[PDB]
Amino acid sequence: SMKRVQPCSLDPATQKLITNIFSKEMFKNTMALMDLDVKKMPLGKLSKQQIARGFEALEALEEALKGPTDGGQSLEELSSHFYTVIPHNFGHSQPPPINSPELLQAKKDMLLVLADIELAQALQAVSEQEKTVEEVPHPLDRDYQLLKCQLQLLDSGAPEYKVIQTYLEQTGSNHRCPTLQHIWKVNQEGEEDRFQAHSKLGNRKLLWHGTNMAVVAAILTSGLRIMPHSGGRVGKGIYFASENSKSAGYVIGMKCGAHHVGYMFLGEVALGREHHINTDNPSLKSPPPGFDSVIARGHTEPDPTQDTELELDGQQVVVPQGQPVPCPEFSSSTFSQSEYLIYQESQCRLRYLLEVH
């Protein structure tokens, strides 16, 4: 017989969030923005095997880019294999050869996003328990439940609301700052325990992490992650910024009606003893011995004299509130704005999610 659909328990803002982060249109938009052939790679067809085969093909390119010339297959031939595994669309012209470190990392990053899209699809698979029960949750409750992540919408007068708003406003773009729509407190439990393990580290800061909308569901289910092919200017870690405007550059939003909707995280990061750098080092896989984080220091930093603190689970967590000011020691840094790196997933726990227009 027909199953009852129970009424949705979620507030309107949370329903919109849930709709957005599981939206098939959103996921396909994201694949189009990454030059993927959505006709050849429908969401239902995405598989862990294909994604692994994709990374294998990129691993062969990487070896060709580094270690020869030694009689291996040409970059063209190796590129062609990759494009067979992971179909791309360049207006049905031939896709281009993956013949630089930059392009190799860009393709690795594309596959990391695609892997989180596939995660979201796999998460939504209907269980046998669900086929047998005679009543089902509203689809949005079901999707929310799949995250195994508590989201609590804040209002204006929550203790931390003004602190968060100030952090956004003071360190966001001066001319056209993202407009704050909603903040949710994020409690992904089973993040709590591994995070407790760094309770000794006094130097905690609440930092920005901007992402593709297509990876928000994955992050809510599993936290911020370091994957085998993660990389960037400061190597294989989790990247954060103290300046919203830096992180905002990584937000991939979506046009909805007359607005552009984007999501940004704030994580509590146990930075411990910081190692400061002033030139790019893509080879890093941990801080130097004796250090707990690497901070690629920018020409500017939110003015430290305006820092405040929030008390999160009884630990003081620094929250910048100042506009960015120059840091003379780092005026010649290769970095305009700071990038904060950790190399263990346990050193971050998600605290807030912001919707910005």
Ligand X SMILES: C[C@H](NC(=O)CCc1nc2ccccc2c(=O)[nH]1)c1ccccc1
Residue ranges that bind ligand X, judged by CB under 6 A: 109, 112-113, 116, 208-212, 215, 225, 227, 230, 232, 239-241, 246-247, 250, 339
Hunting for tokens 């203790």 — which residue is that?
159
* Least distance CB 11 / ligand X (angstroms): 27
Q: Which two tokens stand for residue 357?
A: 């227009």
Kindly list the distances between the CA atom of residue 3 and the CA atoms of 125, 129, 130, 132, in Å, as whole numbers in the listed order: 18, 13, 10, 10
- Cα–Cα distance, 355 to 265 (Å, whole number): 9
CA nearest to 232, candidates 54, 109, 115: 109
- Tokens 């291996």 locate to 72
Give the single-character DSSP code of 328: G
Name the active-site residue from 160, 243, 301, 339. Answer: 339
Q: 13, exposed or middle or buried, with CB in 10 Å at 0-12, 13-18, 19+?
A: middle
Nearer to ligand X, 27 or 240 (CB): 240
Least gap, CB of 267 to ligand X (angstroms)? 10
Is the Cβ of residue 17 or residue 114 nearer to ligand X in the bound state?
Answer: 114
Instruction: Give 75 or 348: the residue with its C-beta nearer to ligand X.
Output: 348
CB of 219 to ligand X, least distance (A): 8
Alpha carbon distance 91, 335 (integer Å): 36
- Of 206 and 215, which has the nearer Cβ to ligand X? 215
Tell me, yes or no, if 189 is annotated catalytic. no
Nearest-approach distance from CB 239 to ligand X, in angstroms = 3
- Residues with a catalytic annotation lie at 339
